[PDB]
Amino acid sequence: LFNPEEFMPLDPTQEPIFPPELLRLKDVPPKQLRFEGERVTWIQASTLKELLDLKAQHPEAKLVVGNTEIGIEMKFKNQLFPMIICPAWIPELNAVEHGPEGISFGAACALSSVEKTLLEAVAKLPTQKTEVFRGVLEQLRWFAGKQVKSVASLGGNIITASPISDLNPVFMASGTKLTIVSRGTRRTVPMDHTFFPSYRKTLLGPEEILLSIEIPYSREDEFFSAFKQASRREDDIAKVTCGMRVLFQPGSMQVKELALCYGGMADRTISALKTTQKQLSKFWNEKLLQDVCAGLAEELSLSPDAPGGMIEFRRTLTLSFFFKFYLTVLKKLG
Amino acid sequence: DTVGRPLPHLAAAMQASGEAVYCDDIPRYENELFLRLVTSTRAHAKIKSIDVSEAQKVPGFVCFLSADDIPGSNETGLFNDETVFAKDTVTCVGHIIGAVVADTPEHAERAAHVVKVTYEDLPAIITIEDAIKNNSFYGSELKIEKGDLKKGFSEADNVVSGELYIGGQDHFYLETHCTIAIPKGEEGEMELFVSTQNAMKTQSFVAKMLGVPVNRILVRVKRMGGGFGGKETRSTLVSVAVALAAYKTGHPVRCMLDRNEDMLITGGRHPFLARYKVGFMKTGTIVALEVDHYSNAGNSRDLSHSIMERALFHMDNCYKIPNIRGTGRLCKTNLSSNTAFRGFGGPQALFIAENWMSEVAVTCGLPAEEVRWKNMYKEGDLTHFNQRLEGFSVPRCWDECLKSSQYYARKSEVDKFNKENCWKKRGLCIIPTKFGISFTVPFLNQAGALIHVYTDGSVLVSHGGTEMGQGLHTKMVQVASKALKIPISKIYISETSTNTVPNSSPTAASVSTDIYGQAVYEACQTILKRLEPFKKKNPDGSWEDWVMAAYQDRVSLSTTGFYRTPNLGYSFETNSGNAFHYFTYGVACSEVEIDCLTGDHKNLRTDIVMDVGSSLNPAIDIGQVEGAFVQGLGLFTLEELHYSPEGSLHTRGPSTYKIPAFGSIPTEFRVSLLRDCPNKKAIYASKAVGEPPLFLGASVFFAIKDAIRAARAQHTNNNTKELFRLDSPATPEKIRNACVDKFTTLCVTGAPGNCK
Amino acid sequence: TDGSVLVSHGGTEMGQGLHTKMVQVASKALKIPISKIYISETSTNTVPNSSPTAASVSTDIYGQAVYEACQTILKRLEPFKKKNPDGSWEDWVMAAYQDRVSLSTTGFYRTPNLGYSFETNSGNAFHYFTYGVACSEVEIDCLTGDHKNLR
Amino acid sequence: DTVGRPLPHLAAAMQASGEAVYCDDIPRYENELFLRLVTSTRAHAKIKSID
Amino acid sequence: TADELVFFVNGKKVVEKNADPETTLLAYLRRKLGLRGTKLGCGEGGCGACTVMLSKYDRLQDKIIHFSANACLAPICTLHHVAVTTVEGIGSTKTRLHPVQERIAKSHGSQCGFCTPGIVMSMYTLLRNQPEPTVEEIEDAFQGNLCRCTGYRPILQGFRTFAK
Amino acid sequence: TADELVFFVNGKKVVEKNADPETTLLAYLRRKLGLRGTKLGCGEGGCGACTVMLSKYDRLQDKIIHFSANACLAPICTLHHVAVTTVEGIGSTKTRLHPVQERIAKSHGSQCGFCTPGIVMSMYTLLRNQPEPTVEEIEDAFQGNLCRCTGYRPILQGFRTFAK
Ligand SMILES: Cc1cc2nc3c(=O)[nH]c(=O)nc-3n(C[C@H](O)[C@H](O)[C@H](O)COP(=O)(O)OP(=O)(O)OC[C@H]3O[C@@H](n4cnc5c(N)ncnc54)[C@H](O)[C@@H]3O)c2cc1C
Ligand SMILES: Nc1nc2c(c(=O)[nH]1)N[C@H]1C(S)=C(S)[C@@H](COP(=O)(O)O)O[C@H]1N2
Ligand SMILES: Nc1nc2[nH]cnc2c(=O)[nH]1
Ligand code: MOS
Ligand code: MOS
Ligand code: FES
Ligand code: FES
Ligand code: FES
Ligand code: FES
């Protein structure tokens, strides 16, 4: 149909040059910028201090990094935010830090950057340390185009708090640590069920901004899986997605900790805490599989008229995903 | 002579460079305004007020248009049963009520959003079942019947009856609907640049709304970024509104729809419900078939009738059935009016056919390919509508596909896989198709061309067809070049326009190559006849010499050409007369692997053998087969439109409506064009290819169904001959729910339940 | 298909009323009111290889081309006239359309028997001649050179 | 049949109203530019330079 | 008093003295700069018809970086000191086609053509980061680009020639 | 710093906030306001193709006065608080023609039509000053309007109907 032998060869040294004038401007120190529109004032914050001052002066000011969510809210939900602050330039919001407990990403780090860093960590570190990382990576597979992942921030996905976020269930199940700041405040909390109190809301004060996110190393006797539904039918509900973690007593099959967190089963990310609490000190066997499935079927039960429908399918996925986790943990145990 | 050569699409390089101009890429006039439609948020309601007070405060706001502003007629649509702008009552979510005009598209958007409508709800009918229960239909029952059904069912060893549903489909042309209208300010003259397959109806509908003669309206179509039938009629929703804005303001006006608007307003493929009963022998031979078809037509007729006719013409697929009755009813519902979509009712009827055929094989406990083969038409058989199948190439396609796909060896590997795997299963299916070639309405089978040869010998060809990616202009240039015996470099097609070729049929029914090819050919013959005396006097001279000599002897170098497809005219009263000119044929074998725990699946391998006659351009035709197949893949396995109980579309963009992606296609994807099968009935022995291959995407669906059957054998029960209902699309939800096991039943929780 | 007619020809309008005359010709030839006929513009993609609008011959030559095209239309419509004799133009046009008869045609005219030769002083240089006579009266001012055109 | 009748020029009313469009009356595209010819001020000469 | 917004498009400096925070890159390219090669297909990040390449000197990484972005969602106000490359920045039929453009066209990877600029820019971006990509990297570079016409096979076949 | 220039065109208020002293009324009408009925024929006052009517309150005469002017030579900066009437201000085929427009058309006074708006405005201005002019006043009304097509006879004959 065509003849590749006749194609012009690629000469990668002959590509359009990066604008030399733009390169000369890299020396110019960053300063706060203000843009004024018909309806919106936009402040480009150059420093963390500037961000915290602005947020103290205008708590209602909306943060925008990648705009991959805000652009949707403004265009399709007719939301208007008269003041926007873009913190993308701020070094602290972009830092990738390797620590004793895990890998920290500034909240403005693009998902592409998260993916690259985590892929490197998985390639170099022992399997037993990278269980949570691998879960994040699985959720980032078949997630969005390279275009989206290059500008979509990690923090943006978290704080968007969509019921069907593929990342929040993994962060919740793993107790991923969130460092949160405002003028005169700084606190770090592991993500848990309390972090999402209601639809599209998080447990942040009106002034508070998410600074950094520490994704933990997995420990000995600790295993993780993440799964997600392969269809999406509503804008922000009814797509099952999950993170699952078990910690055993040293060298055993006896449950010490268990966390099963799901999106797409309610109007926020939730944890099947009643179900998992019942399994503490139990052994990883057929009885546990039965009891967990019984618990999930009850705890995450959906009304026939639940928003999003696909009621049977969603229930079946909650159990089927746990089944996959159950078998995977058995393979990892031995 | 490039006919039969894989010439790339003439505009491909400009498309790759971003130089090809689509409607909205045309520069704006200094004074050009923008229109945004204002549509209903209710399925069925009286309009009690429209409040534009907030819209008027938006910077750049110009005006709000409604029915009262129309100078001519507010009655529109193919069957004159629509409004341009709804006046008293809305009859679907997305029903156009009016439009905002503003100085920028951003401003038009802003203004339209704050237009407030007050409604009084009326009882709505959304579902096909809703419509049947309420006797809500357009027109009367359509029917084709042959033989003696009572006798056939008496002779049958086995009878299977059931119900089946196939969901609709959004066109998702990458370029949405758009029109620019330029009012000239003299005599009602208006010139429109439109993304449409139907310049003629665009022209006539604009003229009717304005109340001016059709000769005042000029419609121009350079190209569409996809059409797929969705621009055969429904483009006029945008065109007529933009024309009104141009008329009213005296400014140029344009509108391009955002995706969410387009999916809501413009209609899609018709959902179908079928109730069917098939009688057959223990051998799998069919002796009786009764199928009642119901389409969900939405809130106007549009092309719904002819779509159902095509459905009825295809309920046989490739199978001889001596006793047969097919009926069809068009459901009148409070949804956006459904329209043409590649296949035009064919894929739905063909899917229904393959579903009961799949059930015959299962019931008989026989290999599906054997039952299909046994029931296949032979050369010279009559269809259920009494048309003779001449040049019936399905057996050749079937045999070649079986061989090249290594079907039998792979069948054994699929079985081996299923023996060795508990929670994943493979499936493999081979399916034939035939697709009738011609508009079901005889008068649409006409085509015009206009050719000019300029004094430098360069040739400008105009024809009634439009380019929407299918390579029609490319093929026409190849045809003209062969016909005139000059290089393709000497020929050009610029656009499609109502002032060069009038009264054109829409570019549809897969027939454009056939009918415009003939018209172009005839125009070329006329030119050759006129040049012949000059060639005779100067036989070693050039084309350019002959052209100049003709010019200087005052011989006209401009001619029309015209073609009228012969011997067409089916009668539902006599069940006789040709419905089609000929049929296009093909066969596809697909293999899948399903995840029985999640409902996800992989498309492992697809092999296609398509009879496109002697191809004018194998590259373009293979492209048509692949693209059509993948759209069919989408229809049957990925694409799902979803509505609220109140009838409001939820799935309004790519985040919630999943068309096939790069990673969706079969890992091994093989297409072959059948060799040595010239078609005497069309231009240079070629065949129509546009729509015929789409149904072959169902091979993926029936492979999935095969896999589900293996899963049910593994975990559900012990009944080998069990029939279970699998509607289309076979989404992860439907696949997963069908793999009945300890999870679906909750038996894993300790409860008793309906698995083994 | 509404019966409205769009005429294109090789001539241009510069104030001389050529389009007016062509509409009058088409109306007479087709036997329909001038209101049903329209000329929008002159364009190279409708009529190619046109001579310039010049030599005073435009009415003569485009008139013939328009006439011929109209005769072709009439021939094609005739069967439908005979099927619906008390019908309207609009009815006949739609019937023709629905019977897949083309409602588009070219017309062409080549002025016969022209070809003067300077090397034989023979052959018609012109098709015919236009003739006229004028009588004018003036009054001059012999002292200024100004004058009145009296009649 | 109006042949031989004094029918006014078809465009006369629009010419009288200023609605008849002549070339320069056509609206300008947003990006449309304007040309002015540069011409000789000499009857016959060599062009030595253009500045 | 507003600051000037300064960015580059296809090597050319753009100085926007009155940037509106609501303005998308796609709107700016098409309706201010008159560069219509970049298309609107959805406005919601799923179709990639609006794909462009962005380049900047990353002051935190100490290097020039290149990546793709959806122009329909990128606020121009995020682009201070960023360089945009569109389809018209890499080649044209009036000058010379870029290899990416030549190969998609010659391989029958363009039918209606509406998705072609976005796909070109996705492939272009890949090559700018990795001039020697694997088949796997190429086959995985287009999750954000939809094509309704081609069934994708020819696009991948044409682009696989860049691999190994 | 600059003052606002305020005038009227066909009864509509024009507020020019940045008037250039060099800008002619003809250029402003055609290229700012998009009123193209008024034509350019010479730019030097001899042809009248650009004729408009101007109206203003006279302090001395204590009345509203109406007179014709060549738009090609009228600086817009002379027009503060003046009302302009162009050919489109008096009638249209979309609404109703003014008697002046109807009569010149039906009398065969328009051939190519390019001079017609200017002649219409000259006659219109006369009638606004004198509703029943003499035959003598009518001919004298057009020393500033040139027509290349008609030979003038039909224009005068058409307008004579306004006399007596
Ligand atoms: C086409 C496409 C496909 C997608 N698919 C998926 C998917 O499959 N699964 C999934 O989980 N997600 C998906 N996403 C969502 C995507 O991950 C988020 O939109 C993105 O991460 C948001 O980041 P952003 O920088 O663009 O946020 P923005 O739109 O700029 O802001 C988002 C929200 O976060 C707030 N915010 C941002 N930064 C901070 C901060 N540091 N502190 C406090 N608040 C902050 C903003 O105020 C706003 O409320 C998809 C998005 C697109 C467009
Ligand atoms: N690229 C492309 N191929 C396409 C379409 C399209 O919009 N784009 N439309 C299809 C439909 S619905 C029809 S009817 C035929 C119409 O063109 P043809 O008659 O020239 O085949 O093209 C088919 N193939
Ligand atoms: N696309 C299409 N349109 C039609 N209109 C009438 N018949 C047909 C048909 O068969 N196909
Ligand atoms: O016949 Mo194609 O336009 S559905
Ligand atoms: O022959 Mo007239 O154009 S001088
Ligand atoms: S236009 Fe579809 S992703 Fe931007
Ligand atoms: S070529 Fe048409 S959408 Fe890709
Ligand atoms: S243009 Fe000739 S007088 Fe003004
Ligand atoms: S009508 Fe032509 S200049 Fe007067």
Using a threshold of 3 CB pairs under 8 A, tell whether chains A and F touch.
Answer: no
Chain-chain contact of B750 with A290 (C-beta, under 8 angstroms): yes
Contact B6/A2 with Cβ under 8 angstroms? Answer: yes
Question: Is the same domain home to F6 and F62?
Answer: yes
Nearest CA to ligand 7 atom 2: E112
Question: How far apart are the C-alpha atoms of F110 and F104, rounded to whole Å?
Answer: 7
Cα separations (Å) of B317 from B360, B438, E103? 15, 17, 39
Question: Is the same domain home to F78 and F124?
Answer: no
- Domain containing E20 equals 2-86
Question: Is the same domain home to A71 and A102?
Answer: no
List domains and CATH numbers for chain B. Answer: 32-123 (3.90.1170.50), 124-170+267-389 (3.30.365.10), 171-266 (3.30.365.10), 390-440+581-746 (3.30.365.10), 441-580 (3.30.365.10)
Do the strands A41-44 and A83-86 form a parallel or antiparallel pair, or are they unpaired? parallel
Concatenated DSSP letters of B210-223: HT--GGGEEEEE--
Rg (CA), chain B: 27
Question: How far apart are the C-alpha atoms of A257 and B401, rounded to whole Å?
Answer: 56
Within chain E, what is the greatest distance between any pair of CA atoms?
A: 54
Residue A51 structure tokens: 């961000």
Residue E85 structure tokens: 């490359």
Give, in degrees to the nearest 5, the angle at Cα B533 between B528 and B537: 125
Cα separations (Å) of C2 from B83, B216, B496, B560, C70? 20, 12, 20, 21, 17
Concatenated DSSP letters of B342-388: TTTTHHHHHHHHHHHHHHHHHHHT--HHHHHHHHB--TT-B-TT--B
| Residue B6 touches chain E, beta carbons under 8 Å | yes
Evaluate the omega torsion of the peptide bond into residue B729 and state whether it is cis, within 30 degrees of 0: yes
Question: Is the same domain home to E77 and E58?
Answer: yes
Tokens 């462009």 — which residue? E52
- Tell me the β-bridge partners of B571: B576
Nearest CA to ligand 1 atom 17: A157
Give the residues surrounding ligand 9 with Cβ less than 6 Å away.
Answer: C 15; F 110-116, 147-150
- Helical packing angle, C58-83 and C89-98, nearest 10°: 80
Contact B112/B62 with Cβ under 8 angstroms? Answer: no
Ligand nearest to the CA of C12: 5
What is the amino acid identity at position E138?
I
Residue A26 structure tokens: 């890299």
- Tell me the β-bridge partners of B643: B649
At B29, give phi and psi (nearest 5°): -65, 150
Residues of D with Cβ-Cβ distance to F112 under 8 angstroms? 15
Q: How far is E66 from chain A (nearest CA, A)?
A: 10
Concatenated DSSP letters of A17-47: PP-HHHHHTTSSPP--EEEE-SS-EEEE--S
Question: How far apart are the C-alpha atoms of A121 and D25, rounded to whole Å?
Answer: 68
Cα A146–chain centre separation? 16
Q: Is B741 helix (H, G, I), strand (E, B) or coil?
A: coil
Question: Is the same domain home to A292 and A262?
Answer: yes
Question: How far apart are the C-alpha atoms of A326 and F31, rounded to whole Å?
Answer: 76
Question: Is the same domain home to E105 and E39?
Answer: no
Contact B202/B262 with Cβ under 8 angstroms? Answer: no
Domain boundary among E34, E69, E86: E86
Q: Is A274 helix (H, G, I), strand (E, B) or coil?
A: helix
Q: How many beta carbons lie within 10 A of that of residue B160, not counting itself?
A: 16
Q: Is C128 helix (H, G, I), strand (E, B) or coil?
A: coil
All residues at 6 or more sequence positions from A333 whose CB lies less than 8 Å from its CB, including other chains? A223, A248, A253, A284
Contact A208/A181 with Cβ under 8 angstroms? Answer: yes
Domain boundary among A218, A239, A262: A218
Q: How far is the CA of F41 from the centre of ligand 9 (A)?
A: 11
Rg (CA), chain F: 16
Question: Is the same domain home to A261 and A305?
Answer: yes
First to last CA, chain F: 54
Rg (CA), chain E: 16
Residue F129, class by beta-carbon neighbours within 10 Å (0-12 exposed, 13-18 middle, 19+ buried)? middle
Helices (H) and strands (E) in chain E, counts: 5, 5
Interface of B with E in 455-474 (CB under 8 A): 468-471
Query: How many domains is chain A built from?
Result: 3
CATH number of residue F120's parent domain: 1.10.150.120
Q: Is E10 left (phi over 0), alpha (psi -120 to 50) or beta?
A: left
Question: How far apart are the C-alpha atoms of B432 and A260, rounded to whole Å?
Answer: 47
Q: Considering only CA atoms, which of B108, B659, D13 is closest in space to residue E146?
A: B659
CATH number of residue A54's parent domain: 3.30.43.10
Cα separations (Å) of E140 from A112, B595, E126? 14, 22, 10
What is the amino acid identity at position C98?
Q
Q: How far is C28 from chain F (nearest CA, A)?
A: 22
Question: How far apart are the C-alpha atoms of A257 and A277, rounded to whole Å?
Answer: 8
Give, in degrees to the nearest 5, the angle at Cα F117 between F20 and F54: 50
Residue E86, class by beta-carbon neighbours within 10 Å (0-12 exposed, 13-18 middle, 19+ buried)? buried
Question: Is the same domain home to A159 and A249?
Answer: no
Concatenated DSSP letters of B150-180: HHHHHH-SEEEEEEEEE--B----SS--EEE
Residue B354, CB half-sphere, CA atoms under 13 Å: how many? 31
Do the annotations mark residue C55 as ligand-binding?
A: yes
Q: Considering only CA atoms, which of B104, B511, B79 is closest in space to residue B332?
A: B79
Q: Is B12 helix (H, G, I), strand (E, B) or coil?
A: helix
Residue B709 structure tokens: 């059957």
Question: How far apart are the C-alpha atoms of B633 and A281, rounded to whole Å?
Answer: 49
Residue F88 structure tokens: 């489109």
| Residue E3 touches chain A, beta carbons under 8 Å | yes
Domain boundary among A33, A57, A92: A92
Q: Considering only CA atoms, which of C95, C60, C61, C64 is closest in space to residue C77?
A: C95
Tokens 């002066």 — which residue? A57
Question: Is the same domain home to A287 and A210?
Answer: no
The contacts found for F100-105 with CB under 8 angstroms, 24 or more apart, are: F100/D16, F100/F124, F100/F127, F100/F159, F101/D13, F101/D16, F101/D17, F102/D13, F102/D16, F103/F158, F103/F159, F103/F161, F103/F162, F104/D12, F104/D16, F104/F155, F104/F158, F104/F159, F105/D8, F105/D9, F105/D12, F105/D13, F105/D15, F105/D16
Cα separations (Å) of A78 from B112, B654, E83? 11, 19, 30
Q: Considering only CA atoms, which of B175, B235, B217, B145 is closest in space to residue B25?
A: B175
Q: Is B569 left (phi over 0), alpha (psi -120 to 50) or beta?
A: left
Residue F60 structure tokens: 């001395």
Question: How far apart are the C-alpha atoms of B221 and B223, rounded to whole Å?
Answer: 6
Question: How far apart are the C-alpha atoms of B68 and B422, rounded to whole Å?
Answer: 66
Contact B355/B115 with Cβ under 8 angstroms? Answer: no
CA B411, B412, B415, B421 torsion: positive or negative? negative
Cα separations (Å) of D37 from B190, B457, D40? 33, 32, 10
- Helical packing angle, B346-364 and B698-715, nearest 10°: 30
Question: Is the same domain home to E59 and E45?
Answer: yes
Using a threshold of 3 CB pairs under 8 A, tell whether chains B and D touch.
Answer: yes
Of A235, A290, A317, the CB nearest to B749: A290
Residue B724, CB half-sphere, CA atoms under 13 Å: how many? 21
Q: Where are the alpha helices (DSSP H) in A58-212?
A: 70-76, 111-124, 131-140, 146-149, 154-160, 168-173
Q: Considering only CA atoms, which of B44, B636, B38 is closest in space to residue B336?
A: B44
All residues at 6 or more sequence positions from A46 whose CB lies less than 8 Å from its CB, including other chains? A30, A31, A32, A33, A89, A90
Question: Is the same domain home to E96 and E152?
Answer: yes
Contact B461/B516 with Cβ under 8 angstroms? Answer: no
| Ligand 5 atom closest to residue C53's alpha carbon, by position in its atom list | 3
Question: How far apart are the C-alpha atoms of A86 and A45, rounded to whole Å?
Answer: 6
Helices (H) and strands (E) in chain F, counts: 5, 5
Residue B5 structure tokens: 């050569």
State yes or no: is B691 an active-site residue: yes
Residue F156, CB half-sphere, CA atoms under 13 Å: how many? 16
Contact B199/B496 with Cβ under 8 angstroms? Answer: yes
Strands (E), B581-725: 582-595, 601-611, 668-673
Domain boundary among E86, E102, E122: E86
Contact B424/B595 with Cβ under 8 angstroms? Answer: yes
CATH number of residue E9's parent domain: 3.10.20.30
Question: How far apart are the C-alpha atoms of C70 and C6, rounded to whole Å?
Answer: 11
Question: Is the same domain home to F113 and F38?
Answer: no
Q: Considering only CA atoms, which of B178, B257, B241 is closest in space to residue B209?
A: B241
Ligand nearest to the CA of E115: 7
Cα B660–chain centre separation? 16
Question: How far apart are the C-alpha atoms of A263 and C10, rounded to whole Å?
Answer: 71
> Would the CB of E150 count as within 6 Å of ligand 7?
yes
Question: How far apart are the C-alpha atoms of B317 and B347, rounded to whole Å?
Answer: 10
All residues at 6 or more sequence positions from C101 whose CB lies less than 8 Å from its CB, including other chains? C76, C77, C80
All residues at 6 or more sequence positions from C33 whose CB lies less than 8 Å from its CB, including other chains? C27
Tokens 């509607």 — which residue? B727
| Ligand 3 atom closest to residue B232's alpha carbon, by position in its atom list | 1
- Domain containing A127 equals 93-218
Question: Is the same domain home to A49 and A132?
Answer: no
Question: Is the same domain home to A140 and A174?
Answer: yes
Q: What is the dihedral of CA B728, B734, B738, B742, to 10 degrees?
A: 180
Residue in chain D closest to C21 (alpha carbons) equals: D3
Give, in degrees to the nearest 5, the angle at Cα B662 between B659 and B666: 95
- Among candidate residues B290, B691, B722, B733, the one labeled active-site is B691
Question: How far apart are the C-alpha atoms of A15 and B160, rounded to whole Å?
Answer: 66
Question: Is the same domain home to F46 and F122?
Answer: no
Query: How many domains is chain E built from?
Result: 2
Burial call A314-326: b when 16+ CB within 10 Å, e when fewer:
bbbbbbbbbbbbb
Question: How far apart are the C-alpha atoms of B53 and B61, rounded to whole Å?
Answer: 11
Domain boundary among A74, A92, A110: A92
Domain boundary among F40, F55, F86: F86
Question: Is the same domain home to E103 and E76?
Answer: no
Resolution in A: 1.6
Q: Is F53 helix (H, G, I), strand (E, B) or coil?
A: strand
What is the amino acid identity at position B2?
T
Give, in degrees to the nearest 5, the angle at Cα A266 between A262 and A272: 40
Q: How many beta carbons lie within 10 A of that of residue C146, not counting itself?
A: 9
Residue B445 structure tokens: 């089978």
Q: Considering only CA atoms, which of A273, A271, A252 is closest in space to residue A262?
A: A271
Question: Is the same domain home to A294 and A307?
Answer: yes
At A281, give phi and psi (nearest 5°): 75, -5
Residue B314, class by beta-carbon neighbours within 10 Å (0-12 exposed, 13-18 middle, 19+ buried)? buried
- Tell me the β-bridge partners of B561: B449
Within chain B, what is the greatest distance between any pair of CA atoms?
A: 97
Question: How far apart are the C-alpha atoms of A15 and B567, rounded to whole Å?
Answer: 60
Question: How far apart are the C-alpha atoms of F119 and F125, rounded to whole Å?
Answer: 10
Residue B684, CB half-sphere, CA atoms under 13 Å: how many? 24
At B352, give phi and psi (nearest 5°): -60, -45
Give, in degrees to the nearest 5, the angle at Cα B66 between B60 and B72: 120
Question: Is the same domain home to E25 and E77?
Answer: yes
Residue C93 structure tokens: 């046009």
- Tell me the β-bridge partners of B460: B452, B492
Q: Is B592 helix (H, G, I), strand (E, B) or coil?
A: strand
Question: Is the same domain home to F60 and F95?
Answer: no
Question: Is the same domain home to F82 and F129?
Answer: no
Question: How far apart are the C-alpha atoms of B335 and B647, rounded to whole Å?
Answer: 7
Question: How far apart are the C-alpha atoms of B442 and B464, rounded to whole Å?
Answer: 17
